[PDB]
Enzyme design. Structure first.
Site, PDB file in Angstrom:
ATOM      1  N   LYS A  51       7.084  23.855 -16.580  1.00 26.64           N
ATOM      2  CA  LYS A  51       8.506  23.551 -16.647  1.00 26.64           C
ATOM      3  C   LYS A  51       9.337  24.214 -15.544  1.00 26.64           C
ATOM      4  CE  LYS A  51      12.290  23.076 -19.921  1.00 26.64           C
ATOM      5  NZ  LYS A  51      13.243  23.526 -18.868  1.00 26.64           N
ATOM      6  N   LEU A  53       8.694  24.056 -12.500  1.00 21.39           N
ATOM      7  CA  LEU A  53       8.697  23.117 -11.389  1.00 21.39           C
ATOM      8  C   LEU A  53       9.752  22.036 -11.587  1.00 21.39           C
ATOM      9  CD1 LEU A  53       4.865  22.559 -10.814  1.00 21.39           C
ATOM     10  CD2 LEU A  53       6.395  24.181  -9.685  1.00 21.39           C
ATOM     11  N   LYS A  63       3.995  18.118 -23.748  1.00 17.13           N
ATOM     12  CA  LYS A  63       2.782  17.337 -23.572  1.00 17.13           C
ATOM     13  C   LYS A  63       1.720  18.153 -22.864  1.00 17.13           C
ATOM     14  CE  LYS A  63       4.565  12.630 -23.777  1.00 17.13           C
ATOM     15  NZ  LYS A  63       5.891  12.966 -24.371  1.00 17.13           N
ATOM     16  N   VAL A  94      -4.342  -6.901 -11.587  1.00 15.65           N
ATOM     17  CA  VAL A  94      -4.555  -8.046 -10.701  1.00 15.65           C
ATOM     18  C   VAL A  94      -3.341  -8.124  -9.781  1.00 15.65           C
ATOM     19  CG1 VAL A  94      -4.860 -10.543 -10.559  1.00 15.65           C
ATOM     20  CG2 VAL A  94      -5.775  -9.269 -12.507  1.00 15.65           C
ATOM     21  N   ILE A  97       0.240  -9.878 -10.519  1.00 17.59           N
ATOM     22  CA  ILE A  97       0.614  -9.911 -11.926  1.00 17.59           C
ATOM     23  C   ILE A  97       1.297  -8.593 -12.245  1.00 17.59           C
ATOM     24  CG2 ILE A  97      -0.132 -10.085 -14.321  1.00 17.59           C
ATOM     25  CD1 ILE A  97      -2.604 -11.535 -13.397  1.00 17.59           C
ATOM     26  N   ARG A 140     -12.397   1.480  -2.850  1.00 19.23           N
ATOM     27  CA  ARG A 140     -11.678   2.264  -1.843  1.00 19.23           C
ATOM     28  C   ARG A 140     -12.246   1.903  -0.474  1.00 19.23           C
ATOM     29  NH1 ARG A 140      -7.503   4.967  -3.114  1.00 19.23           N
ATOM     30  NH2 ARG A 140      -8.038   6.380  -1.381  1.00 19.23           N
ATOM     31  N   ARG A 174      -1.991   9.476   7.486  1.00 19.83           N
ATOM     32  CA  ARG A 174      -1.825  10.783   6.873  1.00 19.83           C
ATOM     33  C   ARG A 174      -3.160  11.532   6.866  1.00 19.83           C
ATOM     34  NH1 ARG A 174       0.576   7.817   2.810  1.00 19.83           N
ATOM     35  NH2 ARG A 174      -0.847   8.706   1.232  1.00 19.83           N
ATOM     36  N   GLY A 180      -6.580   2.799   0.138  1.00 19.33           N
ATOM     37  CA  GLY A 180      -6.563   1.674  -0.773  1.00 19.33           C
ATOM     38  C   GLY A 180      -6.507   0.395   0.042  1.00 19.33           C
ATOM     39  N   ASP A 181      -5.886   0.464   1.218  1.00 17.76           N
ATOM     40  CA  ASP A 181      -5.752  -0.703   2.079  1.00 17.76           C
ATOM     41  C   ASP A 181      -5.412  -0.279   3.507  1.00 17.76           C
ATOM     42  OD1 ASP A 181      -3.175   0.213   2.091  1.00 17.76           O
ATOM     43  OD2 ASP A 181      -2.236  -1.670   1.484  1.00 17.76           O
TER      44      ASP A 181
HETATM   45  O1  DUP Z   1       7.110   2.219  -3.253  1.00 15.47           O
HETATM   46  C1  DUP Z   1       6.735   2.232  -2.081  1.00 15.47           C
HETATM   47  C2  DUP Z   1       5.446   1.827  -1.603  1.00 15.47           C
HETATM   48  C3  DUP Z   1       5.124   2.026  -0.311  1.00 15.47           C
HETATM   49  N1  DUP Z   1       5.988   2.623   0.591  1.00 15.47           N
HETATM   50  C4  DUP Z   1       5.591   2.926   1.979  1.00 15.47           C
HETATM   51  C5  DUP Z   1       5.030   4.349   2.103  1.00 15.47           C
HETATM   52  C6  DUP Z   1       3.529   4.093   1.998  1.00 15.47           C
HETATM   53  O2  DUP Z   1       2.754   5.123   2.611  1.00 15.47           O
HETATM   54  C7  DUP Z   1       3.392   2.799   2.777  1.00 15.47           C
HETATM   55  C8  DUP Z   1       2.133   2.021   2.497  1.00 15.47           C
HETATM   56  O3  DUP Z   1       2.116   1.557   1.147  1.00 15.47           O
HETATM   57  P1  DUP Z   1       0.770   1.591   0.286  1.00 15.47           P
HETATM   58  O4  DUP Z   1       1.103   0.993  -1.030  1.00 15.47           O
HETATM   59  O5  DUP Z   1      -0.179   0.864   1.178  1.00 15.47           O
HETATM   60  N2  DUP Z   1       0.285   3.144   0.095  1.00 15.47           N
HETATM   61  P2  DUP Z   1      -0.509   4.211   1.052  1.00 15.47           P
HETATM   62  O6  DUP Z   1      -0.945   3.544   2.301  1.00 15.47           O
HETATM   63  O7  DUP Z   1       0.268   5.465   1.153  1.00 15.47           O
HETATM   64  O8  DUP Z   1      -1.771   4.616   0.301  1.00 15.47           O
HETATM   65  P3  DUP Z   1      -2.951   3.760  -0.150  1.00 15.47           P
HETATM   66  O9  DUP Z   1      -2.806   2.402   0.449  1.00 15.47           O
HETATM   67  O10 DUP Z   1      -4.192   4.370   0.373  1.00 15.47           O
HETATM   68  O11 DUP Z   1      -2.821   3.561  -1.617  1.00 15.47           O
HETATM   69  O12 DUP Z   1       4.566   2.033   2.387  1.00 15.47           O
HETATM   70  C9  DUP Z   1       7.264   3.000   0.205  1.00 15.47           C
HETATM   71  O13 DUP Z   1       8.069   3.499   0.972  1.00 15.47           O
HETATM   72  N3  DUP Z   1       7.562   2.779  -1.117  1.00 15.47           N
HETATM   73 MG    MG Z   2      -0.133  -1.223   1.684  1.00 12.89          MG
HETATM   74 MG    MG Z   3      -1.892   1.852   2.282  1.00  9.31          MG
HETATM   75 NA    NA Z   4      -0.520  -6.258 -10.395  1.00  9.70          NA
HETATM   76 NA    NA Z   5      11.598  21.796 -14.393  1.00  7.40          NA
END
Ligand code: DUP
Ligand code: MG
Ligand code: MG
Ligand code: NA
Ligand code: NA
Ligand code: CL
Ligand code: CL
Ligand code: CL
Ligand code: CL
Length: 326
Positions: A51, A53, A63, A94, A97, A140, A174, A180-181
């Site tokens: 808390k 933080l 929780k 998906v 969705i 991934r 980073r 993820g993509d």
């Molecule tokens: O709500 C959001 C989503 C993404 N973004 C920006 C920052 C993020 O790093 C970038 C790429 O979006 P992704 O959903 O691809 N996420 P990220 O690349 O950070 O991580 P990963 O794809 O590995 O999940 O778009 C925002 O500003 N707001």
């Molecule tokens: Mg993306």
């Molecule tokens: Mg990404």
């Molecule tokens: Na979805």
């Molecule tokens: Na707090």
DNA sequence: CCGACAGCGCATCAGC
DNA sequence: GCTGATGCGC
DNA sequence: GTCGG
């Protein structure tokens, strides 16, 4: 991962609120809490400690104590047992969705992968591609593959026009060991905040990538943002690589720094930075940083020649991409 | 308490 | 057709 | 759900 159990719990709660409850603020509250706890350099021993933080209040503190004492949370235990909640949560996995469509499909009696496949005619284009690659989109992307993907995109873009500049942002920039993509920022001298001397700037690139068979499907496509599917080429007798989500965002060249800042994220980092900006009297988007007038109306864009300049405006010490993974 | 919670592109829709 | 709201996602 | 004023 000193507090992996707690962050997972909060993430599950965040997903429940977003997907089932459709309470976006609670969703963000939980994510913010998970985030600050994820970087807290100590193994949490109590809700009271947590808390302290920012982002962690009384409810989350309680929780955390329950989780620490029992290793679980009754609230989540029940949620997992609720068929409706479980079904709705699954369908949102998906691409295309969201919370609204998942609840609708469930009402229609569609609540499983098999159900979706038998009712493909009820899905819009995006959803259809998301269903098609459900499995793959779950996997991934090893940075090793991201590097190969980067090489292809940069070389193919260069082939279309040597003046294009493609920068892989997101988790890749980073320094993440897996993503993820693939998020690609694109610029060209013909497209600036002052004019567009060349149309189809984004189209031409997407076209070249499809021609070489790198881009295999399209999720959405406008004049400045393309989102789709791609796949690395495999060798003879070699199993194929999983299909991957890819996005190409075209930004005015003179607004590159605000663009790369936005696209590098993380999303929570951007939220925190943009929030701080507001407290300092500025507003930040992927194009510019503008001062807020005594009225609140954004003023004219301030000069920007680097990402650091943006940090300076809000009186924040510069943070390398690798330290923005909040 | 209580309003604020980051900011925006593309898809699809209702109302006209 | 247009504009504006809403879903969805970055 | 959390929090600053
Ligand atoms: O709500 C959001 C989503 C993404 N973004 C920006 C920052 C993020 O790093 C970038 C790429 O979006 P992704 O959903 O691809 N996420 P990220 O690349 O950070 O991580 P990963 O794809 O590995 O999940 O778009 C925002 O500003 N707001
Ligand atoms: Mg993306
Ligand atoms: Mg990404
Ligand atoms: Na979805
Ligand atoms: Na707090
Ligand atoms: Cl809410
Ligand atoms: Cl649990
Ligand atoms: Cl702007
Ligand atoms: Cl870095």
């Amino acid at each position: 991962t000193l507090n992996g159990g707690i962050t997972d719990m909060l993430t599950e709660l965040a997903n429940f609120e977003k997907n089932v409850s459709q309470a976006i603020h609670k969703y963000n509250a939980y994510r913010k809490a998970a985030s600050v706890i994820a970087k807290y350099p100590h193994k949490i021993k109590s809700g009271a400690e947590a808390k302290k933080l920012p982002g962690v209040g009384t409810k989350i503190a309680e929780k955390i104590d329950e989780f620490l004492a029992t290793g679980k949370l009754r609230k989540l235990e029940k949620i997992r047992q609720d068929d409706t909640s479980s079904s709705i949560n699954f369908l949102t996995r998906v691409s295309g969705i969201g919370p609204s469509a998942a609840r609708k499909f469930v009402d229609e009696g569609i609540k499983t992968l098999e159900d979706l496949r038998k009712n493909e005619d009820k899905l819009n284009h995006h959803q259809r591609i998301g269903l098609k690659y459900f499995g793959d989109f779950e996997k991934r992307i090893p940075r090793e593959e991201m590097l190969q993907m980067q090489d292809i995109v940069l070389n193919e873009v260069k082939k279309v026009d040597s003046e294009y500049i493609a920068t892989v942002c997101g988790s890749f920039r980073r320094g993440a060991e897996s993503s993820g993509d693939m998020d690609v920022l694109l610029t060209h001298p013909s497209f600036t905040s002052e004019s567009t001397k060349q149309p189809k700037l984004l189209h031409q690139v997407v076209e070249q990538l499809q021609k070489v068979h790198f881009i295999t499907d399209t999720l959405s496509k406008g004049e400045t943002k393309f989102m789709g599917v791609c796949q690395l080429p495999s060798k003879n007798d070699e199993k194929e690589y999983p299909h991957r989500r890819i996005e190409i965002r075209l930004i005015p060249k003179d607004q590159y720094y605000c663009g790369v800042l936005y696209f590098t994220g993380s999303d929570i980092f951007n939220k925190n930075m943009r929030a701080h900006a507001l407290e300092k009297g500025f507003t930040i988007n992927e194009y510019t940083i503008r001062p807020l007038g005594v009225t609140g109306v954004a003023g004219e864009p301030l000069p920007v020649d680097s990402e650091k300049d943006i940090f300076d405006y809000i009186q924040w010490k510069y943070r390398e991409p690798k330290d923005r993974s909040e």
